[PDB]
Amino acid sequence: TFEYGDGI
Amino acid sequence: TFEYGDGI
Amino acid sequence: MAIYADNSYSIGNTPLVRLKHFGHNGNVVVKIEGRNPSYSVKCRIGANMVWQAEKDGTLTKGKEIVDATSGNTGIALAYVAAARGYKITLTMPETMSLERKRLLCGLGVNLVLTEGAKGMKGAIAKAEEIVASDPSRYVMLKQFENPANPQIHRETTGPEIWKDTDGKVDVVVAGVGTGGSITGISRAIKLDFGKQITSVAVEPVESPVISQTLAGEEVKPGPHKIQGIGAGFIPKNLDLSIIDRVETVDSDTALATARRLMAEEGILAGISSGAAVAAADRLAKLPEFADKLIVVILPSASERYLSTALF
Amino acid sequence: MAIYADNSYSIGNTPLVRLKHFGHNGNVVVKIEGRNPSYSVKCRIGANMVWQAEKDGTLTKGKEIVDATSGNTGIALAYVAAARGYKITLTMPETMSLERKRLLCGLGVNLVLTEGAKGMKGAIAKAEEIVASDPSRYVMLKQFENPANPQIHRETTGPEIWKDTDGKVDVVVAGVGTGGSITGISRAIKLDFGKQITSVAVEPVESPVISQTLAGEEVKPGPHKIQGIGAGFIPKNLDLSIIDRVETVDSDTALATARRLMAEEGILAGISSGAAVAAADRLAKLPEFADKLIVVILPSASERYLSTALF
What we know:
The complex is a heterotetramer, with 2 copies of chain A (8 residues) and 2 copies of chain C (311 residues).
Chain A (H helix, E strand, L loop, with lengths): L8
Chain C lengths: L2 E2 L11 E3 L9 E5 L10 H14 L7 E5 L3 H13 L3 E6 L5 H8 L3 E5 L4 H15 L4 E2 L8 H18 L5 E5 L4 H13 L5 E7 L4 H6 L30 E5 L1 H15 L5 H14 L9 E5 L13
Parallel strand pairs in C: 3-11, 4-5, 4-7, 5-6, 8-9, 8-11, 9-10
Antiparallel strand pairs in C: 2-3
Helix pairs in contact in C: 1-2, 1-5, 5-6, 8-9
């Protein structure tokens, strides 16, 4: 999963 | 490895 | 004549393709940003953030690029740093998809992996920590706030949409990560070309912070699988003032949609491309949008997602 | 205006980038065919072979595409079949790189895996076997002999090179698989635009059947790792008459060269792209080629080679 800017 | 048309 | 001095200059001019199995009578058209160096829309900001920093004097020979990113922006900065001869360090959680560690390592990136349980914040902390050690040596480009992000979209992505639709575009649908794409495109079309289109931001239903913010509700970010969007906060590079509508899409549907693009349209797009199309399809099937031309940004290509959940 | 009716029409218009760490004073420029739907030069023949078969009446609604290919041509035909609504079966040895089995499966391809120890011949046998079961239902496009292969390169790839160099191109360097690329490009530039350039075919030193043939020596194919070239025979779609020179390159150097393209130029190219550049660099460093503009085809992108030997 992606949270707080993760994966950008 | 690639032989006789393999990988095209 | 048309020979680029290095790969950073070959950005953009991505094509528009009409969808056959989405929308209503061809009202949905997609812009394939996977057709880019480094295979994503971020190649545009990777290039322009470096170019601007050079023009500003903040980036010079000798100085090193340091930044935190666990997505396509790292790959974009990596190829630009390689093309233009900069050293680059990227920080990211120790929870990366190996291939990306190799792709980045292959690109010459100095990988600094942080603890995973910290996530992005861990990584940004390490980035700023490293910049602190010699601010004279390190420049952080800051994609979430660097105005050179939306500016490149205003100067290229937006004008490409205008030109290729002959100014007939009525709606732009784009997922929001940094917000740069929707912001620049919207500014270009509404302010530079003067057409009052409908700008649609897309975010995960799992983490609908833009929707909650605009509704004056409690902002509750959450985890999701739509890589590239849903930062869990409102980034400085999202200009809420040009956003006309916000659509939420769930991870499973975004995924199912990306699979349909491949199987039914022969379009190889990433998870977030499926999200943008699912949102666009919904609008395209409202009678209010029936005679409107809807342009959807597809941010990346699907081979960057082999071994995720897409395949 | 510029909206493609389906993804097959978005082929080509790939960019030229000047190399900084190869050649002599910028005489080497690369054409990035990785910037294509399905990420390879084969998207061009995938499209045109289907288009021609439609125009010929040999391909019609209901009829199924059947062919043998363990390379990029399968991916190209797959995306075209998906875009235009054809069913497709591809045969290939049971020795494929899973990701490719999934990519193809994701594209809707009916995968028929044959025994590996048989290699391509096993697969082609099964393809023709399947076509025999109902020749009225199945059409095999035959990339090694189908004239629609080199024709698309004569009509697009060649003219793009001419236009983007303003007719200043002096040399074209291209690896040979089917031979379609070098054949069409050469025909375009020499016959349609009338310029006497030097056409350079590239093949693996491990399997230099073109070199051996032209020298009147015993033809001895062999195994190599340069995916996409070195078929081990002279294909019908290689027009030897337009080939001015043949350069051989070894697998290790082709690989090392592709790695340099990534790390030093920020160009994400495949193994065969490294081979083409290694050959071009050699010519570019001969004084006879010092004031000559050399254009090198880079057939594919490197993410199609994560987990090969490139990474």
